[PDB]
Amino acid sequence: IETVPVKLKPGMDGPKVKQWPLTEEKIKALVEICTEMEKEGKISKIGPENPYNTPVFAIKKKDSTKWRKLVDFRELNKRTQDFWGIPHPAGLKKKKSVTVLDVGDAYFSVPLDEDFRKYTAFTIPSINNETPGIRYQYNVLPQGWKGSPAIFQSSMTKILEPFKKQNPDIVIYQYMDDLYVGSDLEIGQHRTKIEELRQHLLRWYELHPDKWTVQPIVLPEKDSWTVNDIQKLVGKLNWASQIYPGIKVRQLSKLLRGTKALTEVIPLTEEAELELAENREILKEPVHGVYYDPSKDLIAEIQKQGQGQWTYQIYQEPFKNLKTGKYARMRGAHTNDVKQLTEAVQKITTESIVIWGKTPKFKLPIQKETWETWWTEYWQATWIPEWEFVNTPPLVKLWYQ
Amino acid sequence: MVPISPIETVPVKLKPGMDGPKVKQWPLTEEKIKALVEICTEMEKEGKISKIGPENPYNTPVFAIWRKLVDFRELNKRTQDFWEVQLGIPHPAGLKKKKSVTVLDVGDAYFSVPLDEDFRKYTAFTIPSINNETPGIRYQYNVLPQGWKGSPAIFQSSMTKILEPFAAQNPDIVIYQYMDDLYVGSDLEIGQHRTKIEELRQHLLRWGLTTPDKKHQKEPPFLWMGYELHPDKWTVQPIVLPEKDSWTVNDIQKLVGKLNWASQIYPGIKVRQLSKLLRGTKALTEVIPLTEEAELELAENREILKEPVHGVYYDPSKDLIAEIQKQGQGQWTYQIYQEPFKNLKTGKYARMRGAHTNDVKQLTEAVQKITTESIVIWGKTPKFKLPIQKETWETWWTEYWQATWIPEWEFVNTPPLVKLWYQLEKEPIVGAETFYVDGAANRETKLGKAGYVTNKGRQKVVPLTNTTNQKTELQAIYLALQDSGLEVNIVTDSQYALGIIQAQPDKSESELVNQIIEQLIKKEKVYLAWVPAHKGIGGNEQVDKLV
Numbered sequence: 001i002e003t004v005p006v007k008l009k010p011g012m013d014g015p016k017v018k019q020w021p022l023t024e025e026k027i028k029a030l031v032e033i034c035t036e037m038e039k040e041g042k043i044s045k046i047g048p049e050n051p052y053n054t055p056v057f058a059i060k061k062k063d064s065t066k067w068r069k070l071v072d073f074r075e076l077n078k079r080t081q082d083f084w085g086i087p088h089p090a091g092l093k094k095k096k097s098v099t100v101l102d103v104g105d106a107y108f109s110v111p112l113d114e115d116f117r118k119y120t121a122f123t124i125p126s127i128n129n130e131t132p133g134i135r136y137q138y139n140v141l142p143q144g145w146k147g148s149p150a151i152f153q154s155s156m157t158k159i160l161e162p163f164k165k166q167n168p169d170i171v172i173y174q175y176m177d178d179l180y181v182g183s184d185l186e187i188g189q190h191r192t193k194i195e196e197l198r199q200h201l202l203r204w205y206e207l208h209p210d211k212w213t214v215q216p217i218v219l220p221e222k223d224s225w226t227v228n229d230i231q232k233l234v235g236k237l238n239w240a241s242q243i244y245p246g247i248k249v250r251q252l253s254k255l256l257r258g259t260k261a262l263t264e265v266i267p268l269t270e271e272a273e274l275e276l277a278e279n280r281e282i283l284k285e286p287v288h289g290v291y292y293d294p295s296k297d298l299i300a301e302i303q304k305q306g307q308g309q310w311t312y313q314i315y316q317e318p319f320k321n322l323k324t325g326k327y328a329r330m331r332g333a334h335t336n337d338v339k340q341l342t343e344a345v346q347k348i349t350t351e352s353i354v355i356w357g358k359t360p361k362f363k364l365p366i367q368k369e370t371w372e373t374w375w376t377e378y379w380q381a382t383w384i385p386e387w388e389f390v391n392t393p394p395l396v397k398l399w400y401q
Numbered sequence: 402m403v404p405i406s407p408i409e410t411v412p413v414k415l416k417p418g419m420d421g422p423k424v425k426q427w428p429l430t431e432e433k434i435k436a437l438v439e440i441c442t443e444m445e446k447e448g449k450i451s452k453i454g455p456e457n458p459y460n461t462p463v464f465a466i467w468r469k470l471v472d473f474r475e476l477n478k479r480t481q482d483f484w485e486v487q488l489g490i491p492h493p494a495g496l497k498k499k500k501s502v503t504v505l506d507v508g509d510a511y512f513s514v515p516l517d518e519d520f521r522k523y524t525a526f527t528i529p530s531i532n533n534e535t536p537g538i539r540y541q542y543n544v545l546p547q548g549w550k551g552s553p554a555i556f557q558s559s560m561t562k563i564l565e566p567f568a569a570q571n572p573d574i575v576i577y578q579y580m581d582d583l584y585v586g587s588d589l590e591i592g593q594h595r596t597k598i599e600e601l602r603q604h605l606l607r608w609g610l611t612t613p614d615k616k617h618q619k620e621p622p623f624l625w626m627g628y629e630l631h632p633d634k635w636t637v638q639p640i641v642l643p644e645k646d647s648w649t650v651n652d653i654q655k656l657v658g659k660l661n662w663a664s665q666i667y668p669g670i671k672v673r674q675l676s677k678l679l680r681g682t683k684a685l686t687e688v689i690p691l692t693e694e695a696e697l698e699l700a701e702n703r704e705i706l707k708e709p710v711h712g713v714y715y716d717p718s719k720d721l722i723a724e725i726q727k728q729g730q731g732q733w734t735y736q737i738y739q740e741p742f743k744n745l746k747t748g749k750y751a752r753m754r755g756a757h758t759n760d761v762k763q764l765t766e767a768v769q770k771i772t773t774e775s776i777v778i779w780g781k782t783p784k785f786k787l788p789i790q791k792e793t794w795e796t797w798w799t800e801y802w803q804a805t806w807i808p809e810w811e812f813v814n815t816p817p818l819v820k821l822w823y824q825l826e827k828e829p830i831v832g833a834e835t836f837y838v839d840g841a842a843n844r845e846t847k848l849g850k851a852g853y854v855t856n857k858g859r860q861k862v863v864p865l866t867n868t869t870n871q872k873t874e875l876q877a878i879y880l881a882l883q884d885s886g887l888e889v890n891i892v893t894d895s896q897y898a899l900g901i902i903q904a905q906p907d908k909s910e911s912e913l914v915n916q917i918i919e920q921l922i923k924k925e926k927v928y929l930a931w932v933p934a935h936k937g938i939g940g941n942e943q944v945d946k947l948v
């Protein structure tokens with residue numbers, strides 16, 4: 001009920017960002033939604049004296065036919081002053097199960113600092129630029145802004161105080177418009193506790209971190225090796241030598257001596273088997289000296305493995321993975337690569353939020369124009385990460401497969 | 402006197418850390434001075450301006466050409482940024498046909514809109530007196546000045562704010578607002594239409610706005626922004642192509658621009674050969690000769706622009722269809738229509754700048770472009786007709802390392818068809834010869850060697866002058882392709898070559914790569930394997946090409 005003063009970073013003007021085109025249905029949805037919000041005082045129409053603009057579009061969350069308004073507050077977020085800090089709950093990732101809740105509706109109760117409101121300006125676009133877009137600005141705390149959870153921290157603490165005093169074994173974390181709740185209960189008891197907590201938030205997505213871990217580098221086990229098998233093996237070991245110190249391939253390379261046919265079977269020497277065994281033993285151990293630096297960006301690389309399968313690696317320094325994984329989940333995405341990639345990016349981002357409390361910078365295996373054309377059609381998340389585009393095929397593709 | 406409604410001003414501030422403009426007034430002839438005096442007298446009588454005292458430090462230069470001209474460039478440099486709604490323009494193909502369309506121009510346009518009084522003191526300007534033996538006559542604006550930065554945006558927003566209730570009260574008619582013109586339309590009868598036009602200009606008159614009293618000064622066809630707008634159809638204004646035996650760079654730019662403009666409705670417009678001459682620009686004076694390709698292309702452009710073609714308007718009750726054709730040399734053309742033979746609009750796509758490429762990728766890019774354009778113009782994605790088989794697209798996107806997608810589309814058979822020219826094996830080939838290739842080059846002498854050894858004892862090493870490591874590594878693979886059967890396995894240590902080939906080009910800027918491609922096309926089965934160099938891997942011989 002009392003506005004807290006908010007400014008920008010020194011030497012930075014408010015965001016001016018081109019609004020990209022929308023389909024007619026998304027436009028109509030946004031018109032309806034924003035009309036209602038205007039009737040509720042959450043937003044207000046502005047004049048030409050406001051140069052600032054932030055992109056906006058519409059989505060549909062899981063198990064809901066109701067359109068939702070999503071604002072790409074990325075530029076405003078990086079232009080907004082740093083807000084202060086709560087140390088990340090390192091036990092959240094260690095918990096058996098975690099449920100994510102949408103606490104966005106809460107923000108609209110708290111009013112936004114007047115002087116700052118002109119920076120949250122957005123435009124509902126029109127088809128074919130027929131009539132000028134509908135320009136609004138926010139009066140209350142907007143969803144997607146990084147200042148909104150920072151301001152509501154005290155309120156959220158006050159609301160969740162009894163529940164925290166009730167169950168000390170339940171971990172509670174907050175990121176943007178989402179509230180992550182971790183525990184070790186049973187799925188039924190979990191869901192009932194979630195109904196309890198959501199009812200506790202009312203009067204005022206099952207995710208299991210334990211079923212996800214890091215992944216090792218495995219080598220084939222064969223009774224018979226062809227020249228091709230040994231060549232690929234040597235390639236993989238040579239690559240993995242960039243990560244593990246003691247990997248040697250000279251005894252295996254010794255088998256390839258001479259020029260033979262790729263399909264010809266070569267029996268392994270004892271030295272070769274020994275070398276391979278040692279390499280296995282080495283790969284079984286974790287990676288030497290791998291730490292997390294909060295001052296460094298998180299980078300995520302994604303490879304398309306085909307047949308709905310995808311591999312990914314989260315790291316900071318090259319060959320120093322903090323997390324690795326393989327998304328192969330198929331829901332309704334069978335005929336569409338882009339949908340799969342988008343859902344994969346969302347899942348990886350979510351995992352990243354659970355582990356470190358921030359999103360990674362993605363390196364997507366897709367052409368810029370394709371991604372930029374289609375990614376908003378399959379995006380159900382309230383936040384957005386940063387991304388770049390790799391136009392050169394990586395050779396390491398099958399080395400994670 | 403009927404009390405016309407006022408208009409709320411738009412608050413305007415100068416850019417932060419800046420102060421209002423102060424500029425020395427230019428010396429003027431006595432004639433000019435008298436003219437400016439009479440004009441500014443009339444304007445002051447109208448209320449557009451007002452005399453001010455000596456207190457105001459700010460001043461703007463004024464000229465006479467009689468018509469007065471206030472140079473607000475400095476104030477524009479010092480005035481705040483505004484939200485401009487003119488980014489992009491409505492495309493005629495996006496308009497929906499109406500039985501009646503009337504035009505009301507807003508004479509007394511900017512001068513009917515009040516300016517924020519706190520800002521008026523920054524628009525101050527002076528008139529030099531005769532012989533300068535008296536203090537100059539000081540004036541300030543009370544309305545939106547012509548040439549000011551904030552005039553168009555404020556005017557547009559004001560007019561919108563005024564028009565909103567009438568539009569809400571008349572959903573059965575559509576009103577478009579562009580600069581100093583209003584375009585009204587309706588599917589009603591002509592009498593009811595003219596009636597509602599009278600109602601509208603009355604509603605506007607309530608705020609003290611004037612529209613043409615006589616029969617409206619403009620009637621179809623409408624000449625607007627290079628377009629001709631007829632009742633049943635739209636097209637572009639007639640083309641102008643200069644013909645001279647000596648061409649400059651600027652002339653090339655103008656020609657390219659006009660051809661690109663004409664290409665949105667005239668199908669088959671090609672602009673590559675003339676755009677290739679725009680390398681090494683920034684020099685507007687030069688003489689650039691024509692190739693036979695460029696001359697034949699321009700002749701074909703004069704062939705297409707020979708007879709007029711018209712686009713139609715948009716009917717939402719019918720599907721939206723976009724058909725694509727390959728033209729060659731990275732050129733693509735497309736038509737967007739609803740009924741066959743009746744285009745809504747046309748267009749072209751040129752491949753981007755790259756070392757290697759294939760037809761499927763370019764097709765994908767073209768589709769993306771048309772998709773974006775279509776969402777801009779009609780707010781939906783059209784159904785596509787593509788010259789590519791379903792099976793081809795299937796194989797491509799299933800085996801492509803990148804993620805890729807095309808919206809709903811069907812196969813139209815209109816050659817040339819986009820096809821996959823070759824496909825690499827996923828596994829080594831049984832009974833196929835195994836060529837271990839390698840190439841090396843000396844960084845100093847630019848001398849190198851490329852060759853292969855095989856499992857059957859076949860060997861070759863070829864010496865090369867003026868070459869690099871990458872070139873010799875490609876040359877080795879090419880050699881293996883030349884001297885092998887319809888089925889072949891190839892082992893290389895070149896990450897470069899493997900990258901290039903795994904990118905799957907059907908065409909390249911490098912002749913050697915093109916020759917390798919032509920080799921791949923002739924083959925039945927090709928397996929390309931990779932191994933690390935200098936690992937002592939048997940059969941892979943750096944020692945053979947390093948001599």
Ligand SMILES: N#Cc1ccc2ccc(Oc3ccccc3OCCn3ccc(=O)[nH]c3=O)cc2c1
Nearest residue numbers: 491496497498499502575577579584585586631632
């Ligand atoms: N911004 C902007 C802008 C600029 C110029 C315009 C010219 C005519 C026009 O016209 C229209 C105005 C209101 C509603 C529907 C319109 O056009 C549908 C197609 N059409 C056209 C011309 C004609 O004679 N008959 C027709 O059926 C709308 C315009 C809008």
